[PDB]
Design a protein around this ligand. Sequence first.
Ligand SMILES: *[C@@H]1O[C@H](CO)[C@@H](O[C@@H]2O[C@H](CO)[C@@H](O)[C@H](O)[C@H]2NC(C)=O)[C@H](O)[C@H]1NC(C)=O
Ligand SMILES: *[C@@H]1O[C@H](CO)[C@@H](O[C@@H]2O[C@H](CO)[C@@H](O)[C@H](O)[C@H]2NC(C)=O)[C@H](O)[C@H]1NC(C)=O
Ligand SMILES: *[C@@H]1O[C@H](CO)[C@@H](O[C@@H]2O[C@H](CO)[C@@H](O)[C@H](O)[C@H]2NC(C)=O)[C@H](O)[C@H]1NC(C)=O
Ligand SMILES: *[C@@H]1O[C@H](CO)[C@@H](O[C@@H]2O[C@H](CO)[C@@H](O)[C@H](O)[C@H]2NC(C)=O)[C@H](O)[C@H]1NC(C)=O
Ligand SMILES: CCCCC/C=C\C/C=C/CCCCCCCC(=O)O
Ligand SMILES: *[C@@H]1O[C@H](CO)[C@@H](O)[C@H](O)[C@H]1NC(C)=O
Ligand SMILES: *[C@@H]1O[C@H](CO)[C@@H](O)[C@H](O)[C@H]1NC(C)=O
Ligand SMILES: *[C@@H]1O[C@H](CO)[C@@H](O)[C@H](O)[C@H]1NC(C)=O
Ligand SMILES: *[C@@H]1O[C@H](CO)[C@@H](O)[C@H](O)[C@H]1NC(C)=O
Ligand SMILES: *[C@@H]1O[C@H](CO)[C@@H](O)[C@H](O)[C@H]1NC(C)=O
Ligand SMILES: *[C@@H]1O[C@H](CO)[C@@H](O)[C@H](O)[C@H]1NC(C)=O
Ligand SMILES: *[C@@H]1O[C@H](CO)[C@@H](O)[C@H](O)[C@H]1NC(C)=O
Ligand SMILES: *[C@@H]1O[C@H](CO)[C@@H](O)[C@H](O)[C@H]1NC(C)=O
Ligand SMILES: *[C@@H]1O[C@H](CO)[C@@H](O)[C@H](O)[C@H]1NC(C)=O
Ligand SMILES: *[C@@H]1O[C@H](CO)[C@@H](O)[C@H](O)[C@H]1NC(C)=O
Lengths: 188, 242, 196, 147, 49
Amino acid sequence: TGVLTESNKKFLPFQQFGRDIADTTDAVRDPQTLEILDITPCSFGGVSVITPGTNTSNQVAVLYQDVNCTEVPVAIHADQLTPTWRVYSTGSNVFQTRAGCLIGAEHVNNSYECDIPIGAGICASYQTSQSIIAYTMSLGAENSVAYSNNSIAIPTNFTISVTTEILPVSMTKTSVDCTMYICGDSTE
Amino acid sequence: GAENSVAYSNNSIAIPTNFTISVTTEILPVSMTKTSVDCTMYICGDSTECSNLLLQYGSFCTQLNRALTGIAVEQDKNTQEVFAQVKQIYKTPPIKDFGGFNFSQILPDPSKPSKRSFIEDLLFNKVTLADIKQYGDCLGDIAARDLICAQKFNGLTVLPPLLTDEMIAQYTSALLAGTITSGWTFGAGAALQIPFAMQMAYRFNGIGVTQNVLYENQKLIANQFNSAIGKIQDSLSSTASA
Amino acid sequence: LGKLQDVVNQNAQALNTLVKQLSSNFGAISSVLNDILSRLDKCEAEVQIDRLITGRLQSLQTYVTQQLIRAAEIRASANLAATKMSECVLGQSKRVDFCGKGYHLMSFPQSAPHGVVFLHVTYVPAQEKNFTTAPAICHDGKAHFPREGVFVSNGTHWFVTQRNFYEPQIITTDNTFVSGNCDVVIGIVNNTVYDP
Amino acid sequence: DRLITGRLQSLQTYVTQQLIRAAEIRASANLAATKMSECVLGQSKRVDFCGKGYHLMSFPQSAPHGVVFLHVTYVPAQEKNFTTAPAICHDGKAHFPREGVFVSNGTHWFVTQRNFYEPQIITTDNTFVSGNCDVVIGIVNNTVYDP
Amino acid sequence: KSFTVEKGIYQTSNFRVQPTESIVRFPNITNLCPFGEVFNATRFASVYA
Ligand SMILES: *[C@@H]1O[C@H](CO)[C@@H](O[C@@H]2O[C@H](CO)[C@@H](O)[C@H](O)[C@H]2NC(C)=O)[C@H](O)[C@H]1NC(C)=O
Ligand SMILES: *[C@@H]1O[C@H](CO)[C@@H](O[C@@H]2O[C@H](CO)[C@@H](O)[C@H](O)[C@H]2NC(C)=O)[C@H](O)[C@H]1NC(C)=O
Ligand SMILES: *[C@@H]1O[C@H](CO)[C@@H](O[C@@H]2O[C@H](CO)[C@@H](O)[C@H](O)[C@H]2NC(C)=O)[C@H](O)[C@H]1NC(C)=O
Ligand SMILES: *[C@@H]1O[C@H](CO)[C@@H](O[C@@H]2O[C@H](CO)[C@@H](O)[C@H](O)[C@H]2NC(C)=O)[C@H](O)[C@H]1NC(C)=O
Ligand SMILES: CCCCC/C=C\C/C=C/CCCCCCCC(=O)O
Ligand SMILES: *[C@@H]1O[C@H](CO)[C@@H](O)[C@H](O)[C@H]1NC(C)=O
Ligand SMILES: *[C@@H]1O[C@H](CO)[C@@H](O)[C@H](O)[C@H]1NC(C)=O
Ligand SMILES: *[C@@H]1O[C@H](CO)[C@@H](O)[C@H](O)[C@H]1NC(C)=O
Ligand SMILES: *[C@@H]1O[C@H](CO)[C@@H](O)[C@H](O)[C@H]1NC(C)=O
Ligand SMILES: *[C@@H]1O[C@H](CO)[C@@H](O)[C@H](O)[C@H]1NC(C)=O
Ligand SMILES: *[C@@H]1O[C@H](CO)[C@@H](O)[C@H](O)[C@H]1NC(C)=O
Ligand SMILES: *[C@@H]1O[C@H](CO)[C@@H](O)[C@H](O)[C@H]1NC(C)=O
Ligand SMILES: *[C@@H]1O[C@H](CO)[C@@H](O)[C@H](O)[C@H]1NC(C)=O
Ligand SMILES: *[C@@H]1O[C@H](CO)[C@@H](O)[C@H](O)[C@H]1NC(C)=O
Ligand SMILES: *[C@@H]1O[C@H](CO)[C@@H](O)[C@H](O)[C@H]1NC(C)=O
């Protein structure tokens, strides 16, 4: 099972199949019409699902990795997919990124702190109607510092801050009985 | 190494009369390529029978995916904790008056779409960074038989890093600007301005030598510093073993 | 306390996954010893039970390996905690940002479930003010450099001030030290030094 | 099922090796963060922590999946022999330098800072007195100038 | 393997597409195979030859 396409391969007369590094057959000679056809998997990894956690909402966004938004349906084979998967395949919220195509979240020109990191400097969040937004992250406040060859800044006061930081030290000691785990209480 | 007997006596001391301002380049890995694996696409490529047989190993596959997700989040954490030490994005002053010190090669070039410095440009050009690929080329020209296409067709995807290299360059530029315009003060709270000559005087007093020797030799020191930078500019430009 | 809770959750999840992994047949006719030993005699049950044994032993090996990884991580964390206790609770650390933002003063340990907590108390200068500075002062040809602190002018006079706090005092020959004539220094400015 | 077991074990092997390498990279990243905090954001007194010689500054530069530090350091270069002495017996009392060492060019004596040759004439403010000058080993005679 | 997912981004496996049709592509040969010559043979050979 897979996807058949046409290609170019020089098959000697005693060869019919072709195999790749993984040993799975990749090129086959069609017996009826003498030509070479390439078999590809009819799916691909690279689908990431973005969501605010349940107990908040059921809306989601989908990131199709390393695909242009023009060619998302053919890559995902949306024709054979369910109706509920097709709404997340194309629409008005389609946004192109360096990581891939993001669907289900409106692109926002503003910048915030990262809530749900996505990739390539893009982070997503759940705004307040309620919907998922995707924005370029903010690295911090822009703050130009005055500088001159005869200007120094001196403190006149201070604050005694107290910062709390935590470090793990140990973890739960554990023991395993092979006999009780593998062969529970059977003697054989 | 070289055999070098050192003279020793109860009433003989050796004192320096000069100095050299060396610049040493050292490299540290910070993150690695985040990766994700689809059990179904790798083990049971697209056959339904094999996936039905694999359903009883969902615990194993959930464990694997959890481990790889932890690795990816760890890489993002590493990059953030290394570069985002300060959340105030300082920008260098437009004028370059640092007591003769030339920081041209370690500051952003405004004449490039990316905001990298010259040394950064050399560094990024000295590493291939081959895992970068657009899906559709694998669906198209596959007679070339690229390895990345095989990895993707077997479910082994490479996720992109959270922080774009431009963002990391921005963080580095902010750190450089704070360093040369405020010294160590921007790390301990707010950034407090100071002329660079007085800053390097503070550093000289730190290493255990009076600050006067700086002002009596400031120009010389600056030249040395610039010369050292020049060495780096060629040391990273010829060889690739660094 | 997400770190400690994450540690506890990781251990509990690993154990629960190990229990859940006993449902895998590993190629045998069933994942239950009793079913195999009742349907088949040892004649044919030996091979099935051996497959189960191999699979479950491999599951244990996987769990132990992951536990070793996490133990190494926790050991690194514990070594860092010991270094912090030695260098910040038992002393005053000059390492910047090793123990909290700002200049470290003290640290107070507090126990926590499977972990430790440090209360890094730090000095943070707060209210800054602009000033006009100068590396040196030419008194009568000789150049005066401060011993500790910097030369600062409020517009009219000059004072020596300590570096991290504004406590100016009038220029004096004991606050400063002389070094050679006052022509080589860049940025030097004229003023008189008071001599008791 | 045999194929499934084998390929799952292959995945487990790959994930385990990736965890090992992730731990290695995490150690490297923690070292890089410590260097940035202690050498870029400050001046490190730790010897050879940031480059050979006495550390002055450090400049970070991004690199693909890594960071680069330009440790600028002070390295004393041109050394010269000298005849030293722990203390100077002026008139019975022993003079010890405040900072620096006592150095003679053959005729006179000066106090000189430790990492650079900037001699200045012996003076009561450069030195401090402590007891009589009989217990010290290596002490030598000379006069201290008093303004 | 849970009914609740917390806030975040998750890599998800491939269950979305399923097959719907089957294709057969064999050589077009019409000559029925000589079953009657190997099975309905008047005389078989000795086992040694
Ligand atoms: C200390 O070392 C520096 C360089 O190593 C010397 O600077 C050079 O000195 C010579 C002659 O004085 C000049 O021709 C060069 O142009 C100088 N180089 C630079 C970059 O300026 C310096 O002379 C030495 N000083 C002492 C006291 O030894
Ligand atoms: C700092 O060093 C550079 C190289 O010695 C000086 O010259 C510049 O080099 C860059 C090449 O990266 C050129 O793009 C510039 O055009 C060069 N500058 C000039 C005026 O031609 C540079 O001038 C030095 N910085 C200062 C302030 O002098
Ligand atoms: C600071 O003091 C020096 C001398 O101690 C001044 O130098 C004089 O400058 C004038 C010209 O401007 C010369 O005619 C004198 O010969 C210099 N004096 C000596 C002893 O050489 C210097 O001008 C003073 N700086 C300011 C801003 O007044
Ligand atoms: C340095 O000074 C001390 C005294 O300040 C000298 O000690 C004298 O040594 C001679 C014998 O060599 C004695 O006769 C004197 O009684 C000592 N003087 C006192 C006050 O006790 C010492 O000799 C001097 N060192 C050198 C090399 O001349
Ligand atoms: C002329 C011989 C062609 C050989 C073709 C080879 C393999 C494909 C056919 C295989 C089975 C051979 C016939 C046996 C029928 C057994 C049915 C039965 O009675 O139970
Ligand atoms: C039959 O086989 C021949 C070549 O083997 C091919 O050209 C032809 O298209 C096939 N179909 C028909 C109907 O002949
Ligand atoms: C697909 O994306 C790549 C890079 O984003 C681009 O080079 C290419 O032109 C795009 N193709 C189409 C049809 O948009
Ligand atoms: C963001 O900016 C671009 C041009 O700067 C503009 O075309 C676009 O409309 C803006 N986004 C929104 C939602 O308006
Ligand atoms: C110091 O001077 C600069 C420029 O005049 C100014 O931007 C800055 O705000 C001043 N510092 C304070 C604390 O106001
Ligand atoms: C500067 O300090 C002196 C001494 O305190 C004072 O007399 C003078 O008024 C001050 N001038 C300004 C502009 O602050
Ligand atoms: C400081 O900079 C200004 C202009 O930026 C210049 O006029 C002045 O001469 C400089 N002073 C010193 C000591 O460099
Ligand atoms: C100092 O003295 C020793 C022995 O006389 C000699 O070996 C050494 O070279 C001298 N130091 C220098 C810099 O010449
Ligand atoms: C030692 O220093 C003094 C003072 O500079 C000088 O007079 C004398 O000539 C020097 N003697 C030697 C041997 O260097
Ligand atoms: C130093 O050593 C020499 C011989 O090595 C000896 O003659 C001299 O007395 C010693 N001086 C001191 C203060 O130990
Ligand atoms: C084989 O021989 C029997 C008896 O003559 C006949 O009934 C049958 O049709 C023959 N079958 C074939 C395939 O020749």
